[PDB]
Design a protein around this nucleic acid. Structure first.
Lengths: 322, 322, 322, 322
DNA sequence: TATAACTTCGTATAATGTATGCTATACGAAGTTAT
DNA sequence: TATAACTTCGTATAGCATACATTATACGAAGTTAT
DNA sequence: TATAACTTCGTATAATGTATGCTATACGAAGTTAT
DNA sequence: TATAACTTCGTATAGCATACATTATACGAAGTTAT
């Protein structure tokens, strides 16, 4: 009763031990669960297993994805395990219904989607059009698109780059040192090399933006309606803005989005990462090489961007046709 | 007893958490365990470690495969873990016999088997033998044998193919929008293309059958002793019937089985999968293209199918032969 | 007191859960420890940690290897852990002295040795001399040496081979199916292919020995002074005899062993395995390929036969010399 | 208290279980922890989770590397585990801060460093500057710098080389029977060969020194302000003196340090190792030969040394550049 | 008959594996339906 | 507050190298059986 | 001034990492010894 | 004791596919600030 209160207090004291995103989703799931509980006159904490089971079934009935449901269940489990209490998933009712919901949704066809690919051809076509612009906005966007495709870095890692993180090979190729993440949080860190063509795009951006003024400045920054860049060493370009560059570039080439409300109708923050991964594979690049490129530690995730690369090769259709 | 009664009600309420094939196997182990118990005067629930030990030894004497004995122990362990009771595997005596049985059986020379291969040489032979046949069942069986070898699809997947899933891809070749994935993080569906040869086979079947008279009709259907097909959009051919086409075809060519009791004496549902993988290896197709073919995310099974091809003899044979 | 007696009784009942070699060493270490205990008026079971520490120090003082000492400690730990008691290694005194003994011995230069390599050149030289013999003994020995080098199989796996385990590629190369071991105890199993030259050596042995009479016969068998082979399906050629073939072949080429009493002055049961592993490496064979060849599951052991392959490459001595 | 007194006596009796460098580091953390405790009025033994938490936060504020803070917590954890007491890391509050500190520090941009490279361009420059020098210390330092770059050996290993360990391999080139392995399962020793150039350097040192007047004498020795060497078979040069040759040599060429406080501003003991690996990569030497060079069983460190070479730019740069 | 060629054995020392559980195919055989 | 040239020290931080529980090989010596 | 171009935010859904502990180098600085 | 051609069943055994605990992206909508 008080041991629980202490545990929770300890968790909140050292908040910084978890990503802000985890907290954000913890409160969002708690909001959702607490509302369902109120609407059903139930106690939201500690959670009763039969109540949690009803809630997950309610989420499925609302039409949410299987991964969304697993997230709600996962946030509830963390809140309890860290409170010193037993996890809802510790009961049959909850573990069995989750399995049953995954089964029925997947059987009805549900599948986890992945970002619309932005590949070598898309990059070449965008560079060919934007190459000739003098606008600060255009120069920045093209430089961002290039780094994204060349390095396979997530949008959050890109927004984190500082001018001082950039070095250069003896060959004149740019090098961006990256230190952590989801994960990777390490010592040492990594370096991402840019092709000569791409480092040229970045050079042009630094020049017109004037972010080199201070090595602490973040590489990318906002650019106001009048074309003036606003370098900063305290704030970074929101990842929401970066997803906006991918979306506006797609609209530039293909026009306005659908109306279906569906996701991935245009390029998004993860598009170049899935597009590059796939280009390397279709080129014969070895798995360890492809892995190094994306930072993937296992051969599973990799196979996953290629997870949607399965298409009739015609292999058997050739053996037979001869 | 109140709490295991609740757990058993949990299990039934969310029985959809597991597939019907899984349930049947569970019912099957309980019936056997229970029957052995009654016959030997022991309580079957909860199961005592010493009794489960005498039972496992019993299954060994019955000559069952270690794989099989592990399935009995496994289901027995589910029941108890789900129910709140202690698993027999958690016992030292049970843990010890399983290790003894496993080791003893491997020593006597136990090995896993796999489908007798149905290769191109066999497909050619069959085609030639029943290609001009006007018999509706022959027309249907040849079409089946073709798609099986060409697509490497499993029997349950071929049984689900409906008419509206067939389209045209090129040169009048056919396209089968199949679905070979049962996971959330995977590709929605694939498109299997049939050689020009195989396409003519399916065409002659759909014409002699009339399954196309309704898109909802299943590609394959029943053909009665009067050589008349019976299209249907609600009922598909049992995979048992599909395995029969394979054994019947082998009989046509080799006559009655070997009456040795053994398994894989004739062709079975996986024979075309085993054979197409080998032909693809003999013709030196890239492993990735061989995995896309069978839908393998890894190469642990495929390696078993092509293990004895001279192309897979290893580095040592390479070094020794110069 | 009785729970212990039961545990031990359970261990002995299901003896077959452990290799006969484990038992053999368990009794040998117990013999050693029990003798030291008697000579020092101490109780040998349960073992007192301070007593075990004295014993390990006594073994070090007797000049035994670090791996020998770790074995004695390991057998003592198993006897206790399986008796339901705490392991001697569970105490500081024992865990600290073991670490200290490893440290001091290794610091004084001790190193785990490995078998004298039997490589491609040795095999070619032995085949060149024995190729012309008509003696059953010679024909068998050469066939054994060939299979050992070609397959990298341990002597115990070789003595286990039965005539029925041998199949053949479509190319005329022999194939030996192997099922388990130290380890590997599996389902499925593996196939080892022989080069055309080596399968010829084996063919010649089967012919002159007459082991093909029964597919259950073990491939290798004894050969008496009069040249007559003694095929058997119940007994195998002792691994001690197989180590004898490697030793006699070395003496044939180099003459009588030293007098130092040292180990590995001549080829032994593991010689072809370490020799083949090393030949592949020096040939550019990839690790996964080399791994497949020896059955190694990890890249560590492999690096270990090559563990004694480190020699001045001259790499730096070339960069500088130009 | 009786049982932790016994454990502390266990630790001291078998202190040889750990190296002297390990002991010094342990004494160092205790002194700091104890000093912090007294200053803040807390008991230092056993350590309470909440106090260790305030201490770790203290070390973070002192600006120490996460690696360093983990060393304090680590030793603190040894002490307690060895002693029978409960480890502070086993506490939720301590577990939480370590995670917070680790994450917070990685976010501020913390990265590991490594020796400033001493490449061939640097060796050439130094040779040219002090090659005709008659000064005995210059003759000794050049010899050292040569062996370091040529052999990639660490300082403690070069400090141990005695005269009787040098032999001749070919064309009058030298051979150094070194020992770079501290494990039981490894190779006894290696033989490092020196280029013809480097060999002439060591020869001129042994002649101007007279260390060869007794095989037992260490290759390298003290050279007093009167330019007179002092051979000895019982005393070797401190690795600190060896690091001094590196910094002194860098001073000769670049002058006083950068007074920034930072690390690796001049050359250190590992500079030749970092530089020789890069030169070997620039000249495209096979990774295996680069590992044999530095004595690496893996390639996790070597990759850090050659991370920014254009030859190690990745597949993406390869694809993008065509 | 001595004796090659093992086998058995006991102490000494090097090498090696480290998971399961759910679901689909195998196949003889009983059950069903329209020729 | 001689000074070059080290050594010894204390504390930070980079570079490695794993443990546990079996199972299997190394080899001298003594026993075994068809010749 | 309206307005481009963000930022912040809250619900929805995809992606990812899964270790430590022992020992050696780094380097300013105090200690020692023979020029 | 019609029979071809299946279907349904029961039990053996081969073929796959993982969980947990975070952390990070997807995108519409509403608020914010230099122009």
């Amino acid at each position: 009763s008080d041991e629980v209160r202490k545990n929770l207090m300890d968790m909140f004291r050292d908040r910084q031990a978890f990503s802000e995103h985890t907290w954000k989703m913890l409160l969002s799931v708690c909001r959702s669960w607490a509302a369902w509980c109120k609407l059903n006159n139930r106690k939201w904490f500690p959670a009763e297993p039969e109540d949690v089971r009803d809630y997950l079934l309610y989420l499925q009935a609302r039409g949410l994805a299987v991964k969304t449901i697993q997230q709600h269940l996962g946030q509830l489990n963390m809140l309890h395990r860290r409170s010193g209490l037993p996890r809802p998933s510790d009961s049959n009712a909850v573990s069995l219904v989750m399995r049953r919901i995954r089964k029925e949704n997947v059987d009805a066809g549900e599948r986890a989607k992945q970002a619309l690919a932005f590949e070598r051809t898309d990059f070449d076509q965008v560079r060919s059009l934007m190459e000739n612009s003098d606008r600060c906005q255009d120069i920045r966007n093209l430089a961002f698109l290039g780094i994204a495709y060349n390095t396979l870095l997530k949008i959050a890692e890109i927004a984190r780059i500082r001018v001082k993180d950039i070095s250069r090979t003896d060959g004149g190729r740019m090098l961006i040192h990256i230190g952590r993440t989801k994960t990777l949080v390490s010592t040492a860190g990594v370096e991402k090399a840019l092709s000569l063509g791409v480092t040229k795009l970045v050079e042009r951006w630094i020049s017109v933006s004037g972010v080199a003024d201070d090595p602490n400045n973040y590489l990318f920054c906002r650019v106001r309606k009048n074309g003036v860049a606003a370098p900063s060493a305290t704030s970074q370009l929101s990842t929401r803005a970066l997803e906006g560059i991918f979306e506006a570039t797609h609209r530039l080439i293909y026009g306005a989005k659908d109306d279906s409300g569906q996701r991935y109708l245009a390029w998004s923050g993860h598009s170049a990462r899935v597009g590059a991964a796939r280009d390397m594979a279709r080129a014969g690049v070895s798995i360890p090489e492809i892995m190094q490129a994306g930072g993937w530690t296992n051969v599973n995730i990799v196979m996953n961007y290629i997870r949607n690369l399965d298409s009739e090769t015609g292999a058997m259709v050739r053996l037979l046709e001869d």
